Each structure stands twice: as structure tokens, then as C-alpha cells.
């Protein structure tokens, strides 16, 4: 049972790695390829920075 539990623990570590990868591919999906999308995200990030500055 403890052996199988250790196996499942290693599998959960794999699941965490895959969650990181999934997040990464969502962030890569953030780039659709439309210039309007890229420009909107750009202006958004710039306003976010200017607000953070205070």
C-alpha cells in the first residue's frame, strides 16, 4: 500500500508539472496572432504599469 501511495505521490508531482504546462499553453493561447489583439493587450499592460507606479 505504501509503495502504491508513493507511486501516486509521484503521479501527483507529474500532475503539478502538467498544471504548469497547461498554464503556459494558456498564456501562449493569449497570443492569438491578431495584431488588434496584441495591441489591445499591449495598451492594457501599459496602463496597468502606470497605475502600479503610484
Amino acid at each position: 500500500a505504501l509503495f502504491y501511495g508513493d507511486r501516486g505521490l509521484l503521479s501527483g508531482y507529474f500532475g503539478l508539472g502538467g498544471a504548469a504546462r497547461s498554464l503556459g499553453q494558456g498564456l501562449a493561447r493569449l497570443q492569438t496572432g491578431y495584431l488588434r489583439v496584441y495591441a489591445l493587450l499591449f495598451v492594457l499592460g501599459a496602463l496597468l504599469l502606470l497605475g502600479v507606479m503610484r
Binding site: G24, L27, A28, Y38, A39, L48, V52
Partner: protein, 427 residues
């Protein structure tokens, strides 16, 4: 008086190309770049200012890096159009002017002078190359507008357009932010990163080499002049490195993946900006420029249009020296000991920790460990079984260039106490 050499050679070759073969024009461009680099060496410890133009340790180191990247990227390009060399010369002079001044408006003029010829150099005429050039030009002109309004708000908050002026509160903060937007877009920092993957994927690999080395060098040189607030710096670093490495995880193409990795690396370099040591940053950028030029020279030897991940495999069996150098470059970009990329990373992190930014530094380190996934999926893939892939094993030109780059990387990783002593005034 290196800028003088650059301008003289550019203007002369402009008309000379009418009577000279493009091969002769390429030889001439190479000679001029090497001569400017030699002058930079002989003027080591000779800071020289005439107007807003100022050559100091920063100017010297970063223009040395840019000249190296330009030499390497020119060596590979054999096109029979001397304009494809005129543009590189123009961009080199523009980046020198960018790194050698504090005047905001002259900085804008230098930015345009270096950026415009790259837009034209991004045209191999491949259909994706035009899309890349279009995204690049549009986002670049938008960022130029933002930087210009920031310079105006700087002139509003203070009587001069030169950085270092005392500065007001919220309005000065607003001016600093409007300058930082353009500077980070040019440095491929997120959330201004979207252009970088598309442009690296679309542009020809040697051009992308030129970009990812010289453009990033000059951009961080100009960034060091700004007094960026720590909260804004923290935000940029976090978003940049996180998004860079995460989205790089999902990338199936080497150039786009390397673009996201370069986003993460810009995020890393932005730490030295906390203190603006520029010795740490000079060293970091020396290492990163060498490694990236190496990697992109190999990618150019593979394919100029696009190189998939599997194309990298079997590179050791094809050329052992090339496979090994590509592995070394992947490790130096991962920032692992005993390599000079690790020393640059360590110096940036030391500057950051000295600035007292702990959570940001921790997040950067976590995302850097995340980067090891794809850094190893590239370096180790060299040993896999060669699949169907075009491979042209380079000239002795590119072979010796790649080998010398890797050798310099490892040597300055083992004994950084050789060059690092002279990234200041240069004793």
C-alpha cells in the same frame, strides 16, 4: 571617434555599392565593424563626450557586444544585395547612438535610426515574414508615440530633456512610466511581449540573431539610464519571466520558444536595473549575447526560414562541435554553473537582493527553474536520432565563430575575475 568611423563607412558604401560588387561591399562592412571594435578596445578607459553624445564604460561594453553580434550576423548573410549590409550598418550606428546618450529626444532619433532598417531586414519575402514585419512596425510606431509623450512629460516635469533631472511626484512618475513602456517593448518585457514570438518566428534566423543580441544589448544600456521605480520593476519582472517561460513551455517551434525564453531573460536582466550597477549587467549581457549568437548561428546553419525542435536532433552526429556548442549555449541561457551565463544571472540576482526585492527574486528563480524544461529539451535533443531535416554544416566562418563564442562563454564562466574587473573604467 568610433561613431565617426561608423558614419563615414555607411555614407561611403551607400554610393560605393554602385561600382562595387555586393561581395566587396560585404567585405567592406566587415572591415569597418572590426575597425570600430578595435578603436573601442584602444579607447578602453578613455571616456569621450562631445555633445549629448557620451562614451563611458557602458557605451564601450554594450557597443562592443552589438558590434560582435552584427559581425556574426553579417558573416552568415551572403545575399547579393549590398543594401542588406547598408541596413545592418545603419542599425549598428543607431544602437551606438542609443547607448551613448542621455538626451531623450536624441535617444528617440537613435531608436528610429536603428529600428527602421530592421523592419526592412525582416523581409526575406516569405509570407510570414511580411506579417512579422507588419506587427513589428505597427507595435514599434505605437511604442515610439508613447516614448515621445513620455519625453514630453519629462520636459514638463523638468526644464530639460536629459535624464537625471530631479523630478516631480505623480507627473514625473507618469513621465517615467511612459518612457518605461517603450523601453520594455524594445526589450521584449511582458506584458509587452506579444510581438517577440511572432517576429522571431517570422524573421530570418541570422536577422533574429542580430536582433536578439544587439537590440537587447542597446535596449538594456538605455534602460540603465532610467531611475525605474521598484514597484514597476517588480511588476515587469514578474509578468515577463512568468509569461515568457510558461508560454515557452507550449511552443513547438525553436524560434518562437527562444523568443519567449528571451522574454524571460529580459525579465532576469531587469533585476540589475534595481541598482543599475551596469558591471553586473555588462557581464550578463556579454554572456547572453555570445550564447544567443551561437545558438542562432547554428539555427541559421540549419534553416533560415524556420527550424522546428526535431530539426535540432542528431546535431551531434551531424557535427559534434556544433552539437556541443549548442548544448553549451542552452546551458548558459539556462544560467547554470560554472558558466558565464550563470555569473551574469548571479550578478543580477545579487543586485536585486541588494535592492531588497525578495518575493520578486524568488518568483524569477522559480520561473528560471521552470525554464530548464525546455532548455534541456533543446540542449539534449542534439543527441536524438536524426529525423528528416535539412542540414548544411556551415562554413569554417560560422564554425569558428560558434566555437569561439562557446569558448569565451566557458572561459569567462570559469574566470570572470579577468574581464569583470574591467567593466568599470577598465583598469
Amino acid at each position: 571617434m568610433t561613431l565617426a568611423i561608423l558614419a563615414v563607412f555607411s555614407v561611403a558604401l551607400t554610393l560605393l555599392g554602385f561600382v562595387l560588387p555586393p561581395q566587396g561591399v560585404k567585405r567592406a562592412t566587415l572591415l569597418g565593424l572590426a575597425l570600430a571594435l578595435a578603436s573601442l578596445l584602444l579607447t578602453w578607459g578613455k571616456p569621450f563626450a562631445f555633445g549629448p553624445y557620451a562614451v563611458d564604460g557602458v557605451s564601450q561594453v554594450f557597443t562592443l557586444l552589438a558590434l560582435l553580434g552584427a559581425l556574426w550576423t553579417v558573416g552568415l548573410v551572403r545575399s547579393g544585395r549590398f543594401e542588406f549590409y547598408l541596413l545592418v550598418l545603419y542599425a549598428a550606428l543607431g544602437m551606438h547612438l542609443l547607448a551613448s546618450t542621455r538626451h531623450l529626444l536624441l535617444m528617440l532619433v537613435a531608436l528610429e535610426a536603428l529600428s527602421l532598417p530592421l523592419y526592412a531586414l525582416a523581409t526575406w519575402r516569405r509570407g510570414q515574414g511580411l506579417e512579422a514585419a507588419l506587427k513589428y512596425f505597427l507595435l514599434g510606431a505605437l511604442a515610439a508615440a508613447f516614448f515621445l509623450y513620455g519625453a514630453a512629460l519629462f520636459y514638463g516635469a523638468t526644464g530639460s530633456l536629459v535624464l537625471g533631472a530631479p523630478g516631480e511626484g505623480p507627473l514625473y512618475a507618469l513621465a517615467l512610466g511612459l518612457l518605461l513602456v517603450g523601453l520594455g517593448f524594445k526589450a521584449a518585457l511582458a506584458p509587452f511581449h506579444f510581438w517577440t514570438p511572432d517576429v522571431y518566428q517570422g524573421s530570418p534566423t541570422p536577422v533574429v540573431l542580430f536582433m536578439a543580441t544587439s537590440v537587447k544589448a542597446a535596449a538594456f544600456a538605455a534602460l540603465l539610464r532610467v531611475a525605474a521605480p521598484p514597484e514597476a520593476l517588480a511588476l515587469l519582472v514578474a509578468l515577463s519571466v512568468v509569461v515568457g517561460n510558461l508560454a515557452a513551455l507550449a511552443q513547438k517551434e525553436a524560434k518562437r520558444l527562444l523568443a519567449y525564453s528571451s522574454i524571460a531573460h529580459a525579465g532576469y536582466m531587469a533585476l540589475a536595473l534595481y541598482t543599475g550597477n551596469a558591471q553586473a549587467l555588462g557581464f550578463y549581457l556579454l554572456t547572453y549575447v555570445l550564447a544567443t549568437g551561437l545558438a542562432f548561428a547554428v539555427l541559421s546553419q540549419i534553416s533560415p526560414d524556420r527550424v522546428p525542435l526535431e530539426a535540432l536532433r542528431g546535431l551531434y552526429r551531424k557535427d559534434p562541435l556544433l552539437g556541443l556548442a549548442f548544448l553549451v549555449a542552452m546551458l548558459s541561457l539556462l544560467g547554470l554553473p560554472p558558466l558565464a551565463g550563470f555569473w551574469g544571472k548571479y550578478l543580477a540576482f545579487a543586485e536585486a537582493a541588494r535592492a531588497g526585492a525578495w518575493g520578486v527574486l524568488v518568483l524569477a528563480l522559480v520561473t528560471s527553474a521552470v525554464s530548464a524544461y525546455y532548455y534541456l529539451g533543446l540542449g539534449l535533443a542534439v543527441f536524438a536520432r536524426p529525423e528528416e531535416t535539412p542540414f548544411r554544416p556551415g562554413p569554417p566562418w560560422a564554425r569558428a565563430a560558434v566555437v569561439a563564442a562557446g569558448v569565451l562563454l566557458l572561459a569567462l564562466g570559469l574566470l570572470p575575475g579577468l574581464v569583470l574587473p574591467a567593466l568599470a573604467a577598465g583598469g
